[PDB]
């Protein structure tokens, strides 16, 4: 939503030349040990589970 | 009859527990020897309360 990628760009014989940028993006995984710091995987408490 | 070439009975194949009980992802050991590059010493802190 950055209208960077978001706004129309016409072809390139038209007014508009622009080009969608190739930036990088991020997104937060929710999970349950990510919603509360209290709540936390015991990666030490856990050797015989494969995560 | 004719003499039969000799079968070698070579079985072998007693295979490895390569494969963990379930992922046995748990090797823990802590760092002892004092990490390395032992730094400096007491640095003279002191106190600064205007005597």
Redesign the interface.
Known sequence: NTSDMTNPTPAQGQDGARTLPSKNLVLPLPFFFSRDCGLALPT?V?????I | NKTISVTLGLRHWKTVSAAPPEKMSKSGVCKIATNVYNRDGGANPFLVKYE
Do not use: K, Q, R
């Not at chain 1, 856990?46 to 494969?50: G, K």
């Open positions: 030490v856990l050797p015989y589970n494969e």
